[PDB]
Structure formats: structure tokens, C-alpha cells
Amino acid sequence: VDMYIERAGDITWEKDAEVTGNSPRLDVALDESGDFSLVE
Amino acid sequence: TTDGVYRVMTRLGSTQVGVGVMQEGVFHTMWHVTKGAALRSGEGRLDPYWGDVKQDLVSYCGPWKLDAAWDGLSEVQLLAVPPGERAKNIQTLPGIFKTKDGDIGAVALDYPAGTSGSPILDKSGRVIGLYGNGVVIGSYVSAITQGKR
């Protein structure tokens, strides 16, 4: 199994981007395995 | 070696497992995308240089170079590179992961798994982190994961 990379674009801000998504505020914990979980 | 955003592919057919950022001669992606495997770039080979499972990050060819951070107020853009689709910009106001060690920006955007590693940009075009490590609230929310330079 070989893994390879292909260029897909410049890193640039686009003035005409689609805009979407919420901005939730969440209490979370980060464990040793890099996994985030919700906390109450 | 050119600066830019890249697909991370694997081989029957090919499948896109993730995305990463080339900057200053270093390739940046999420650990869970490559598990630290060497990467082919044309006839060249990219070897892992630094990685950390808890941060879910890895750099190739040199140390992590990305250091911009979300300002906590402004909208940002996910430069999403989904499998089979042209790179595209999605603008959003991040929410926040509140943790015992401080706050992390988070984006409530749910793109295919092969988009993991896609950069999140501030208004100046600087990469403030990578997309693809997060939590489910049933919508997925990704941390804005940034490394240390």
C-alpha cells in the first residue's frame, strides 16, 4: 500500500465563498488517544 | 514541493484518504490520515519528521511550520478538498471547544472523511489549523487543530 500526494490548489481566501454552519459552544475533553468527547 | 493544498491518496483503484498543506517545504496533515506512513510525491519520497497522536498531527520533511491562530471573533474559511471535487472555500464563524486547558476554535461543518487535513484559513490566507478531529453533538463539529512552531 503506497500513499501519494497530488496538488489540488493554492491556499487562498475566496471573497465569493459559500457561507454556512453554526457556532456551537461545547464543553469537551481530549484524551491521550487524541479523541475529543463531550463533558457535562 | 510547491506550496499548496494536496490530496492524500492511497492504492486496485485509488481512494482519497485525506488532505494536507505544503508550506516552507514541509507537508502538514493529520496523524489519523497517514498513521505516519511515508508519502510519495511524484518520483520523490516524503518521510515523517514530527508527529503526535494526541494532537492528531504529523509533519513531513521538517518541523511543523503553521502557527497562525483563530482570533476568536472573525469568520474563517475551510479550504475543503473533498474526494472527486475541486478545492472549494466554505466560510463560517467558528464555535468553541471549551477544555480544561483552554478554548479551541471549532467548525460545525460535516464533509466526507477524505477531507480530513483540509486547512482552515483566516482572512489573510494564513492556515489557522486543520479540519478533521472533532466530536458529534448528530452533527459533526471539527476542532480547528493547530500545531506548534
Numbering used by the authors:
A (entry chain A): 49 to 88
B (entry chain B): 18 to 28, 31 to 156, 159 to 170
Cite, word for word, the article reporting this structure.
Here, we present two crystallographic fragment screening campaigns using a 96 fragment sub-selection of the European Fragment Screening Library (EFSL) provided by EU-OPENSCREEN. The performance of this subset was validated in two fragment screening campaigns using the model system endothiapepsin (EP) and the NS2B–NS3 protease complex of the Zika virus. EP is an aspartic protease with the catalytic dyad formed by Asp35 and Asp219 and has served as a model protein for finding inhibitors for other aspartic proteases like β-secretase, a key target for treating Alzheimer's disease. As a second and real-life target, we addressed the NS2B–NS3 Zika protease which is crucial for the viral life cycle of the Zika virus but with its shallow active site challenging to target.
The protein construct contains the soluble part of the membrane bound NS2B co-factor and the protease domain of the NS3 protease/helicase protein of the Zika virus. The NS2B–NS3 Zika protease is a heterodimer, the NS2B co-factor wraps around the NS3 protease domain and forms part of S2 and S3 pocket. For the second fragment screening campaign LigandFit and PanDDA were used to identify binding events. With this campaign 18 fragments were identified as crystallographic binders with a total of 22 binding events. Out of the 22 binding events 10 fragments are binding in the S1 subpocket of the active site close to the catalytic triad forming π–π stacking interaction with Tyr161. Fragments EOS102546, EOS102659, EOS102811, EOS102592, EOS102818 and EOS102869 form π–π stacking interaction with Tyr161. For expansion of the fragment hits seven representative hits close by or at the active site were selected. The binder based on fragment hit EOS102659, EOS41783, is slightly tilted compared to the initial fragment hit with an RMSD of 1 Å between MCS of fragment hit and initial binder. Binder EOS41783 forms a new H-bond with the backbone of Tyr130D and interacts via π–π stacking with Tyr130B. The compounds EOS41783 and EOS90861, as well as the fragments on which they are based, were assessed by TSA, but no temperature shift was observed.
